[PDB]
Design a protein around this ligand. Structure first.
Ligand SMILES: CC(C)c1cnn2c(NCc3ccccc3)cc(NC[C@H]3CCNC[C@@H]3O)nc12
Lengths: 65, 297, 281
């Protein structure tokens, strides 16, 4: 009765959001402001702000009430 | 107003908590009745209301109902019998490796969900990890919890109980992410293992001394940009104690978990997701069922 | 996150006529109550007259939030305006005066969005005598729990503003056919301000609203963006989702075209009837 990680499947009713570590290698990070050294030192990376913006953009895009 | 008040469960700065029976179902609930001038309804109550209305996960406290009268609101929760602090302090309970695995697993699941919904708990400590009678741990006390990932907001740095406060908050980070909860999970894991507060600093500078004395003073190679933090002051170069000399009973898998949770660089410090993917959870022994977790009675 | 929000679950409705029923029912209950309190009396407002006053007081909320010192962030203004809309969905403008609920909506929004304004800083933004500011504060605090009860304790509001930024990032990185999508920003913000006056925020997702605003700015620019929808958003594989999405954006644009502002001489009469109904409450 061991754990095995399951990816936490929640339906976002909209397009696939590119994963947090892909954002730079897919060029999304060119189009947001960079994290300042203070922000970086605290753990804010602008991958956070980028990913949150992309997640909101696609959240319920395909949902109708 | 469908709630018959049974027992008194505690008082804190903003609220008194009571055990109540929901008359409409005969469920036992905890009613947190908010205490009070010209500011209206207390923000700590509204913070808890706004965030817990948007979250639904086994390992986060369910806000079952809310109601009130003229600026005195009251929030109804799942009744939890105990907290992890009572388990940690109860010298009659043995915290086996499977118990520690189970408590960690449920915490990180709750925290994974919470972090995926872009909320920092921002007050993680053994008090705030409540256990129901079925042995399901829930995150509770959302009074400091905040939405993160927005640069357009500054956050305060005085926002985890000192002993569980990450070094970026002690060095005065006003922008941060999941590292402030993931450090506190480290501190809780350490306290599950040791049965005593891991880094019990008397002040914020003493907390930094306790951290660096225990885990080593971070280099700018370990934590780039560290020197940029508002309240950065340089410390003496402590070597740190090797984690197997601290956690003498920890396996190498558990030491990798602990090490990942305690990285000084909050970017490099493991997320709840990547914590859950670590071989510590996947290995033997299995995490205990909630029905078999130790019950402080 | 919107896709599991209280907003999606409870406050995004199937049609503009479902909203009309809620409001008609709220108007009816005030009359039914007032007559049971001691029946087709011209002192009452009709639902369309309540609608004109709600449109008027939405606009005054916008102006209050516009001039507000310290500068109120766009998500607080959007959260306030959403509360104002949601309140007067199940509540009569004859029972609770919209000038007070406007301010209670703003005050609750400031608190909910962590825009830590003090009560004296808040009512200092009312162009009133200081006795009237303190009187207005008493009314703001008096109505605050009432607002929260009438919102069903669902306080988080998802505005189009962050999804709009997300699409503007996504356009730049994945859709190089639109070179410089920031040309769309001003005219997409204009559409976003227009669609906020309508019932769209109760009918569509904030992502749909944000996308409509972007694509309407693009169509206004002579830029086709069907390839963004089909190729980039993958709707080439699910034409039945492309159809639904284009229908939503079409219905949302038509919902802006059918918007008529609250007319100044109409409002000037309706306010007197509103005041008369409040005097004789
Ligand atoms: C408000 C809600 C989250 C809640 C549900 N059960 N419960 C209990 N139950 C009794 C108890 C006794 C001892 C240790 C833990 C729980 C006590 C309690 N006390 C209030 C605070 C105290 C600090 N820890 C977090 C609590 O919510 N809050 C709650």
């Amino acid at each position: 009765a061991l754990y095995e990680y399951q990816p936490l499947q929640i339906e976002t009713y909209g397009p696939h959001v590119p994963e947090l570590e892909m954002l730079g290698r897919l060029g999304y990070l060119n189009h947001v402001r960079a994290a300042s050294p203070q922000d970086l030192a605290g753990g804010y990376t602008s991958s956070l702000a980028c990913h949150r913006a992309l997640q909101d953009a696609f959240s319920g895009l395909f949902w109708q009430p | 107003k469908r709630y018959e008040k049974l027992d008194f469960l505690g008082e804190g700065q903003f609220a008194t908590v009571y055990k109540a029976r929901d008359k409409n179902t005969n469920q036992i609930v905890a009613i947190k009745k908010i205490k009070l001038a010209k500011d209206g309804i207390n923000r700590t109550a509204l913070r808890e209301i706004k965030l817990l209305q948007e979250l639904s996960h086994p390992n986060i406290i369910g806000l079952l109902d809310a109601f009130g009268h003229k600026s005195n609101i009251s929030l109804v929760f799942d009744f939890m019998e105990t907290d992890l602090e009572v388990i940690i302090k109860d010298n009659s309970l043995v915290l086996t490796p499977s118990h520690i695995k189970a408590y960690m697993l449920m915490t990180l699941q709750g925290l994974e969900y919470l972090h995926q919904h872009w909320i920092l708990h921002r007050d993680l400590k053994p008090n705030n990890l409540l256990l129901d009678e079925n042995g399901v741990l829930k995150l509770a006390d959302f009074g400091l919890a905040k939405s993160f990932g927005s640069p357009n907001r500054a956050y305060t740095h005085q926002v985890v109980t000192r002993w569980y406060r990450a070094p970026e908050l002690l060095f005065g980070a006003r922008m941060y992410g999941v590292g402030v909860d993931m450090w506190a999970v480290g501190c809780i894991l350490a306290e599950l293992l040791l049965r005593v507060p891991f880094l019990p600093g008397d002040s914020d500078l003493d907390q930094l001394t306790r951290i660096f004395e225990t885990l080593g003073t971070p280099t700018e190679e370990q934590w780039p940009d560290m020197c940029s933090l508002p309240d950065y002051v340089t410390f003496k170069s402590f070597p740190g104690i090797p984690l197997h000399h601290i956690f003498s009973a920890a396996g190498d898998d558990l030491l990798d978990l602990i090490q990942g949770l305690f990285l000084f660089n909050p970017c490099a410090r493991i997320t709840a997701t990547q914590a859950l993917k670590m071989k510590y959870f996947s290995n033997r022994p299995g995490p205990t069922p909630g029905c078999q977790l130790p019950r402080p009675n | 996150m919107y896709h599991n929000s209280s907003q999606k679950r409870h406050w995004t409705f199937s049609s503009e006529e479902q909203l009309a029923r809620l409001r008609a029912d709220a108007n009816r209950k005030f009359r039914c109550k007032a007559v049971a309190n001691g029946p087709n009396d011209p002192v009452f407002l009709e639902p369309h007259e309540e609608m004109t006053l709600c449109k008027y007081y939405e606009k005054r909320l916008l102006e209050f939030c516009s001039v507000f010192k310290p500068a109120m962030p766009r998500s607080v203004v959007g959260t306030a305006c959403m509360y104002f809309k949601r309140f007067y969905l199940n509540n009569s403008v004859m029972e609770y005066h919209p000038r007070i609920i406007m301010l209670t909506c703003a005050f609750l929004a400031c608190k909910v969005d962590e825009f830590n304004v003090s009560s004296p800083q808040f009512v200092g933004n009312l162009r009133e005598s200081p006795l009237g500011q303190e009187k207005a504060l008493e009314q703001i605090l008096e109505y605050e729990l009432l607002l929260i009860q009438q919102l069903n304790f669902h306080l988080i509001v998802h505005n189009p503003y962050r999804p709009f930024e997300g699409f503007l990032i996504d356009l730049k990185t994945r859709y190089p056919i639109l070179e410089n999508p920031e040309i769309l920003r001003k005219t997409a913000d204009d559409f976003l301000n227009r669609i906020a006056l309508t019932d769209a925020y109760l009918l569509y997702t904030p992502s749909q609203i944000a996308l409509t605003a972007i694509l309407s700015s693009a169509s206004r620019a002579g830029i086709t963006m069907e390839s963004y929808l089909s190729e980039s958003l993958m709707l080439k594989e699910n034409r039945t989702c492309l159809s639904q999405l284009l229908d939503i954006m079409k219905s949302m644009r038509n919902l802006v075209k059918k918007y008529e502002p609250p007319r100044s001489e109409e409002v000037a009469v309706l306010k007197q009837k509103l005041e008369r109904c409040h005097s004789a409450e």
